[PDB]
Amino acid sequence: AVSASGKWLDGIRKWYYNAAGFNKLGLMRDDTIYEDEDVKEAIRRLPENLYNDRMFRIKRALDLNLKHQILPKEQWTKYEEENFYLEPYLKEVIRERKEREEWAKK
């Protein structure tokens, strides 16, 4: 299943991305994640410019949901343009936590 189903698998992944409407509010995938202690620590590490952009997008999304509106189609988020900016920081934090637990059980 290479170059015959990976493109098909991407298709279903894109379908679900559109089914989830957070793009229609201009939100990126990473902004939607639940904020637990690990996520809070990861956000702390973000550079100022990324952190400021994330804050504004959340604010604008809350404002739009207050009015019960959505963005025009021209400004919706794409499934081929989204950046997973938060992934590296979350991955490192989880690894550090697991290391501490592993050392702590022996």
């Binding site: 902004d31 939607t32 639940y34 904020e35 804050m55 959340i58 604010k59 999304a61 809350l62 404002d63 949901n65």
Partner: peptide, 11 residues
């Protein structure tokens, strides 16, 4: 809590 599930400290 808010419907979106994201923290609303900003608003």
């Amino acid at each position: 809590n808010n419907p979106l599930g994201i923290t609303s400290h900003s608003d």
